[PDB]
Write a protein that binds this DNA or RNA. Structure first.
Ligand SMILES: [Mg+2]
Ligand SMILES: [Mg+2]
Ligand SMILES: [Mg+2]
Ligand SMILES: [Mg+2]
Ligand SMILES: [Mg+2]
Ligand SMILES: [Mg+2]
Ligand SMILES: [Mg+2]
Ligand SMILES: [Mg+2]
Ligand SMILES: [Mg+2]
Ligand SMILES: [Mg+2]
Ligand SMILES: [Mg+2]
Ligand SMILES: [Mg+2]
Ligand SMILES: [Mg+2]
Ligand SMILES: [Mg+2]
Ligand SMILES: [Mg+2]
Ligand SMILES: [Mg+2]
Ligand SMILES: [Mg+2]
Ligand SMILES: [Mg+2]
Ligand SMILES: [Mg+2]
Ligand SMILES: [Mg+2]
Ligand SMILES: [Mg+2]
Ligand SMILES: [Mg+2]
Ligand SMILES: [Mg+2]
Ligand SMILES: [Mg+2]
Ligand SMILES: [Mg+2]
Ligand SMILES: [Mg+2]
Ligand SMILES: [Mg+2]
Ligand SMILES: [Mg+2]
Ligand SMILES: [Mg+2]
Ligand SMILES: [Mg+2]
Ligand SMILES: [Mg+2]
Ligand SMILES: [Mg+2]
Ligand SMILES: [Mg+2]
Ligand SMILES: [Mg+2]
Ligand SMILES: [Mg+2]
Ligand SMILES: [Mg+2]
Ligand SMILES: [Mg+2]
Ligand SMILES: [Mg+2]
Ligand SMILES: [Mg+2]
Ligand SMILES: [Mg+2]
Ligand SMILES: [Mg+2]
Ligand SMILES: [Mg+2]
Ligand SMILES: [Mg+2]
Ligand SMILES: [Mg+2]
Ligand SMILES: [Mg+2]
Ligand SMILES: [Mg+2]
Ligand SMILES: [Mg+2]
Ligand SMILES: [Mg+2]
Ligand SMILES: [Mg+2]
Ligand SMILES: [Mg+2]
Ligand SMILES: [Mg+2]
Ligand SMILES: [Mg+2]
Ligand SMILES: [Mg+2]
Ligand SMILES: [Mg+2]
Ligand SMILES: [Mg+2]
Ligand SMILES: [Mg+2]
Ligand SMILES: [Mg+2]
Lengths: 134, 158, 259
RNA sequence: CGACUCUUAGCGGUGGAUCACUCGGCUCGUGCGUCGAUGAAGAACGCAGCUAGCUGCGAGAAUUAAUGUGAAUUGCAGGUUGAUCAUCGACACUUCGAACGCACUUGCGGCCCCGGGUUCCUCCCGGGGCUACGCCUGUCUGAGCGUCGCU
RNA sequence: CCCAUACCCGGCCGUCGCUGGCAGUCGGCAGAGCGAGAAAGAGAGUGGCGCGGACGCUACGCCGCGACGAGUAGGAGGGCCGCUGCGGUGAGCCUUGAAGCCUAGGGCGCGGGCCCGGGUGGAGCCGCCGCAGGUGCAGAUCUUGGUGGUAGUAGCAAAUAUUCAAACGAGAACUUUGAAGGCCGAAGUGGAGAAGGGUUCCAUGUGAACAGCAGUUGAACAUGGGUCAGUCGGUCCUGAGAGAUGGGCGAGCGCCGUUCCGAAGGGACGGG
RNA sequence: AGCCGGGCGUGGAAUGCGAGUGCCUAGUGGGCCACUUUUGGUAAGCAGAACUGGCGCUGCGGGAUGAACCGAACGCCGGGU
RNA sequence: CUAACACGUGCGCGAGUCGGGGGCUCGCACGAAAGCCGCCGUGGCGCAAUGAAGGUGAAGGCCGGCGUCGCCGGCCGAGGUGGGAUCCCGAGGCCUUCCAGUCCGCCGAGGGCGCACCACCGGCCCGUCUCGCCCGCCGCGCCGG
RNA sequence: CGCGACCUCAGAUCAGACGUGGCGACCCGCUGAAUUUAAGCAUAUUAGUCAGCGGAGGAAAAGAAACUAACCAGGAUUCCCUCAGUAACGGCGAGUGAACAGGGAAGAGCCCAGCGCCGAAUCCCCGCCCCGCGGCGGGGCGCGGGAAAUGUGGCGUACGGAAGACCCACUCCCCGGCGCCGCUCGUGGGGGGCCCAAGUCCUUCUGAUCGAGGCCCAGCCCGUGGACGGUGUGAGGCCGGUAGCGGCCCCCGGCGCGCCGGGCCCGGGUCUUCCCGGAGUCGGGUUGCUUGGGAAUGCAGCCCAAAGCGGGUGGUAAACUCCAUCUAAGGCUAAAUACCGGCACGAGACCGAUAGUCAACAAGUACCGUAAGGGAAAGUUGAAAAGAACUUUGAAGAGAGAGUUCAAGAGGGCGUGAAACCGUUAAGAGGUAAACGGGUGGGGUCCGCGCAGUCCGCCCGGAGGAUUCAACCCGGCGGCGGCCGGCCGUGCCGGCGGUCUCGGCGGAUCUUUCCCGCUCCCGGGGGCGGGGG
């Protein structure tokens, strides 16, 4: 149960903050879990999604064992687009269907210097937390 | 209009009383704030008494209460002089002092003199310089057992 | 409500004539809200009847003796299996409902230890019942931070906090109370008496010092003693079925005499 | 039989009730408790590739710098030595407005210093800096058959 | 001979009274009563096989006898009548379908109301013990919103007047062109300005809405364009007047006053 | 006159019926009609009183109709009168 | 809805009762709750009334000591009459083969003790009026009782 | 006449500063009504309130007695409880209405003028040099300027003070710069940034799962984390978060330590001598307002107008007389207290789009009025636009097919979709407007999932079939009762009773055996406070 008096548990306040968070909070919010192999390798559970990571779709009409590369991340709509998930409209042109990152798992990451810095920081903090828990 | 039988009443609600209404919904918050300030000051003055300076014995000034004994505003100059305490040093060593009070009798004066002498015997005075003590000072060994005391110092009893 | 809600406008009644209902109306202007009826409880917009005021008597005071009486009654009723079961608590496996454990549990630090202790004491069925009872509240209370409701679970009375509160904090339905600071609001949830409670040895020892015996006053309170019994032998079945009262009775007429 | 009228039901209109939702209110409490001639509050006019309103901003005009963050913004186009967001300490901040050269039409000036005409010899054009009231301390220049002193 | 809600007999509901009765369900450990005209003991004592027997009793319950039942203003009681939220409780209900709404379906209750079936609907809801209230509408020339009959009715009648042919166009009494007949009749239904309006001006396009018929048309809508000054005005002067300073008054924002209780010229030929 | 003590029950007319007592209290304070008595008035469905009963507050059978007249007052029903 | 008052009802304590203001409780999900204070009952209401005020301020009944007792002791103790729910007693009376003879329980003339409450008669306290005598002393008086 | 001082008064685009205006919830100073009540109304009341004017701060104002009291006396201001709806005022009607004492929150005291003493010992500004300078300061040098004797600074202020003499003590405090170490209340001050546990496991519903069942014996995994929000219904374990005296980084502060420079020479007691106070002010008269203040509480105008053992107050006017208590007419001062404005937050037995702010939305917006000013209506497709390609009729609006979707029975003001009112279909009926109560009858839509009619014991008879009854043995369990022990008592009695004390708590019971400290008395006698018995 929350005991900090300076953080709110009000439903309307939380929803307002969620729906008007700025883009650099949207990046934090739209994070998705790593695969089992990546989790065991990096000792990290979740990672904010980037432009060209690939994904397994876990829930929804498009769940399956297809590795799909993300094409772009629409933070305004809280959505990512995957190069394989898509549907054709009336005229026949094909448009991407939005998938929320929370229903998404990374197969392997795009290892940029900032990405590996973030991974090492997360792993170090988790390991020191576990060592304190010892 | 009067009913069958009852009391004649004079309610004082003929003004705009609803504009000047003092609700007490901040009473617990006020108590919490006063407490916090109290403990903050108690921590601020580290070994000194939390209540404050000692005060004197006084008699309530009325036929209704002249049998009772209060805590006064401060010791008067006659009592300080006959107890051998300087009026300026008493305030800085913890004795409340006021110059308004007289002394018509002798029993009260002697009682307050006894109180001041007991206070001198009881207080522990820290060095003016922590390295080198002075003549009018307390030795080092009893400094280790100096602690704050709660409530008024030497409380008044009837 | 706001002290000036409904009175923000300036309106006068058109008065007799004009074939209108003789109520204040918003004056002038080329707007829908013009000549519409401003004040009064019957108008759209406008003031409520008898606006609620912040100086309502929200709080009540109860006598200290009455509070202590209620606490004593709740404590006494918590020791009867019939009342505790009728409160809904599942205690059919509990070895002894005045449940007392040693002071070692007072130093528990991890939730797993608390869960294991509950399983050993066979009170885990009540926690399972609470888990099952966890549901969604009905009505407008959902949009007012009262989204989720659940059943009350057992109470745990301790004497010193040595991680006991942290250990049992996360288990749903468990209510922790210090033995020196019991409150009726948690001892008798609902106003109904007979909540299931689990005591520690130190708290059980301190109980009779807190509330005193029949011949010894309470040491921790200034001057308090247990409330006197109005009737001692409350076994009505005996009081009827005893020879000395049955002797002084007339024969029971039990033949019906219909019209 | 047919038309018309009435009643009940099905369906379809008309209308927008009820119910369920709520980035809004109301009330209580907490900490802080800070505007302005170094130009406030307020108003006006402008600023986006496609922009009317709302919002943001001020000719550096939906923002510059700096720091944090770390790959977007998005309705369509276009193009990691750091995109976008946030913070905000550097810089900038049009006209009115206590509003300050005089007046309120944006009209009319004065003084000083620069750049064009000149090749300062003056006009003319452009640019920059001053030019409100009251009041305090000091400075300078004064006034008085005011009180005196030497001639 | 006929008939009232009157009277008599009977059934049922309720109220009141009897401050009526029942803890005696006393069982192989027992013995089944306290209705019977007569205040009170089925009184206790000492001497001359088959193992068996319905319901009950939420005592705030159940049962039995009598009498009675109008009602405005008003008073009181009971509501397992109803609405919203809170503390408890239902190992409650619910995407295998909640709330809400509709119904020629099946029922309950004297009633407030409620329970099922069917349909629609798509995410929450209710029972019981308590607590709290912004808690129940037929009216108030009630407030807001919506919709009727009237009614395809009143009406589309002030200032003489229109007709022929062609073109465009889905579409022509109303547009455009040509022809004819008319009116305004120079104190105009003409040609230009002031005030006011503020893009209504011009070209192209459209025909949803508007132009109380219609429109191929418009001061409508949509895209674009358009106002060029030494000499035309403003800009300057002062008029009736307005209004600072000095001064006076004023608790005060300020007000009076315009030469009046003011050291009110910052200019100049010339000479040094 | 007040006190004490003592003795007398055929409960001293008929009929009927439980009674006494205390708080708190709403609405009302415009009335009207009828037999009889009665004042003013030519008189009135006028104005004003006394007693009782009604209407108002009340439905039902009858007077064709009807606030007041005659009968009778009321829970939902069956039979009889 | 708030405040005041009155009365009726339910609960706690009871000649007392009440923490409402404050403080102590590691402040803080609930909790702004709850618990505690007792040498924090100041204080309020109640326990005493009356008078304008100075002020005063709530029983007494029997025997021995000087009835024509001055006046000390022995005591006894907060009235009396009527009506009074209940309780006590109890003449008599409640059964069966008879007879002697009990136990226990119920009935019941009359007679007791009489709750609350009502009525009445007394008594006591404060103000006021009339009459009259006596007593006390640190200050013997426009004194006090 | 001229020259030079001083006084008084001018002028400046002179050098350098300061004020204006706004907000205004809370605060201070003025001005200041009438609705209303009195069942009329004028005094009263509303009310020193609304409106009007001025001036601030983070709080303001008040404030260290010209006080309260009359007691065995208290002792600045402010705030709460109580005093108390009381004393009192009032056409003594309606109504109005404090204070002292007492308990608390907080608590802090001081400074001038004067009287005097010190060679004006004082202050401001310009120039140069040195330090750091984003709150313009410190040191030095200037025959630099000015202010000021019509009075600056040190000592000093009612609690007395000063000077001299004699005894006693007799020095580290503050400031301007620089560096260092550690600490910072509940948690180590504050602020910012970045991170830290556990299922998308196996089946099964769905359009979509966060649903349902399971996950052994570690009753899936975490839990100091089961608040909340998002995600295609309903999620402790998907994600953000949440808990944690959890981690890392950056910045600012406060407290201590050290160094340099600068100022500072300071106190207490006794004796002797001196000195000591605020004027058109108090006070009196009158007038007007105000107050509970009543032969005048407070304020103000006018007139009169002081004294120094004086003056003020002592709640009934006056004279006489003693007592009590302060020292007016000069000044500063935090805390407790107030806060419908502002910034940033937390919460709720509140409202849920005719409600709640007027305003959930391009709301003080559209719009109205010359202006002061007045002032709305308006939320919801869907999980995702997947927002209906294409064919066909029409000039087009608008349709029929086709298609998306779980659903178009969600088609761009689209969730649900009521009533009034209307169209159509079906059924029925119709000359006393319609509608209504009672009683039947007739016809209908649906229902009984009706259509050979209930079941239940105990027997009798017949056809069957079982691992079969009673009685015994073994073991376990339970109920009831009478011997052995044990526990409790809202019961009693006793003991030489009790860890050292030979238990605790309390007592308006005592203590020349008690003890200690304090005061009085010439090591001694008595009283008081505490401890002991
Ligand atoms: Mg945290
Ligand atoms: Mg009345
Ligand atoms: Mg409203
Ligand atoms: Mg609902
Ligand atoms: Mg129809
Ligand atoms: Mg623009
Ligand atoms: Mg930048
Ligand atoms: Mg950057
Ligand atoms: Mg002009
Ligand atoms: Mg009958
Ligand atoms: Mg009735
Ligand atoms: Mg219907
Ligand atoms: Mg939905
Ligand atoms: Mg409500
Ligand atoms: Mg209605
Ligand atoms: Mg016509
Ligand atoms: Mg013309
Ligand atoms: Mg023209
Ligand atoms: Mg045109
Ligand atoms: Mg038309
Ligand atoms: Mg030209
Ligand atoms: Mg003027
Ligand atoms: Mg008459
Ligand atoms: Mg009647
Ligand atoms: Mg009748
Ligand atoms: Mg007739
Ligand atoms: Mg009949
Ligand atoms: Mg009354
Ligand atoms: Mg009136
Ligand atoms: Mg009047
Ligand atoms: Mg008046
Ligand atoms: Mg007044
Ligand atoms: Mg005002
Ligand atoms: Mg100002
Ligand atoms: Mg400020
Ligand atoms: Mg101040
Ligand atoms: Mg003083
Ligand atoms: Mg005081
Ligand atoms: Mg009182
Ligand atoms: Mg009078
Ligand atoms: Mg007043
Ligand atoms: Mg006081
Ligand atoms: Mg204190
Ligand atoms: Mg001097
Ligand atoms: Mg599951
Ligand atoms: Mg996580
Ligand atoms: Mg007055
Ligand atoms: Mg006097
Ligand atoms: Mg003075
Ligand atoms: Mg003063
Ligand atoms: Mg001051
Ligand atoms: Mg809270
Ligand atoms: Mg709605
Ligand atoms: Mg809608
Ligand atoms: Mg649907
Ligand atoms: Mg719809
Ligand atoms: Mg038909």
């Amino acid at each position: 149960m929350k005991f900090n008096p300076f953080v709110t548990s009000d439903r309307s306040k939380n929803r307002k903050r969620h729906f008007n968070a700025p883009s650099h909070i949207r990046r934090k919010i739209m994070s998705s879990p790593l695969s089992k192999e990546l989790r065991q390798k990096y000792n990290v559970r979740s990672m904010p999604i980037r432009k060209d990571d690939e994904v397994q779709v876990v829930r929804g009409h498009y769940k399956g064992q297809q590795i799909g590369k993300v094409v772009q991340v629409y933070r305004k709509k809280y959505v990512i687009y995957i190069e394989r998930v898509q549907r054709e409209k009336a005229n026949g042109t094909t448009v991407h269907v939005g998938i929320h990152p929370s229903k998404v798992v990374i197969t392997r990451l795009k290892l940029d210097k900032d990405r590996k810095k973030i991974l090492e920081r997360k792993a170090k903090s988790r390991q020191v937390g576990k060592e304190k828990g010892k | 209009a009067p009913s069958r039988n009852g009391m004649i009443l004079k309610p004082h609600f003929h003004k705009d009383w609803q504009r000047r209404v003092a609700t007490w919904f901040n009473q617990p918050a006020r108590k919490i704030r006063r407490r916090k300030a109290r403990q903050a000051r108690a921590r601020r003055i580290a070994p000194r008494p939390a209540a404050g300076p000692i005060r004197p014995i006084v008699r309530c000034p009325t036929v209704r209460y002249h049998t009772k004994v209060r805590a006064g505003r401060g010791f008067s100059l006659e009592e300080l002089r006959v107890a051998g305490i300087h009026k300026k040093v008493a305030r800085t060593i913890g004795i409340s002092v006021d110059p308004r009070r007289r002394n018509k009798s002798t029993e009260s004066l002697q009682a307050n003199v006894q109180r001041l002498k007991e206070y001198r015997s009881k207080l522990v005075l820290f060095p003016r310089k922590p390295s080198a003590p002075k003549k009018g000072d307390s030795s080092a060994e009893e400094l280790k057992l100096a602690t704050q005391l709660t409530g008024p110092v030497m409380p008044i009893r009837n | 409500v706001s002290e000036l809600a409904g009175h923000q406008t300036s309106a006068e009644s058109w008065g007799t004539g004009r074939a209108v209902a003789r109520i204040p109306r918003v004056r002038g202007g080329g707007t829908h809200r013009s000549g519409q009826g401003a004040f009064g409880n019957m108008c759209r917009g406008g003031r409520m009847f008898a606006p609620t005021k912040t100086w309502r008597r929200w709080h009540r005071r109860v006598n200290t003796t009455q509070k202590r009486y209620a606490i004593c009654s709740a404590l006494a009723a918590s020791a009867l299996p019939a009342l505790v079961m009728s409160k809904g608590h599942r205690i059919e496996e509990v070895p002894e409902l005045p449940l007392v454990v040693e002071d070692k549990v007072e130093g528990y630090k991890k939730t797993k230890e608390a869960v294991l202790l509950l399983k050993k004491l066979k009170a885990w069925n009540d926690i399972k019942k609470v888990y099952a009872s966890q549901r969604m509240r009905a009505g407008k209370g959902k949009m007012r931070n009262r989204r989720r409701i659940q059943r009350r679970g057992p109470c745990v009375i301790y004497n010193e906090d040595n991680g006991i509160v942290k250990a049992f904090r996360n288990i749903p339905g468990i209510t922790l109370l210090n033995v020196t600071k019991l409150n009726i609001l948690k001892l008798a949830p609902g106003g109904h008496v007979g909540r299931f409670c689990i005591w520690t040895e130190s708290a059980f020892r301190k109980l009779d010092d807190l509330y005193g015996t029949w011949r010894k006053a309470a040491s921790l309170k200034s001057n308090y003693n247990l409330p006197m019994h109005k009737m001692l032998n409350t076994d009505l079945s005996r009081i009827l079925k005893s020879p000395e009262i049955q002797r002084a009775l007339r024969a029971p007429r039990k033949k019906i005499h219909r019209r």
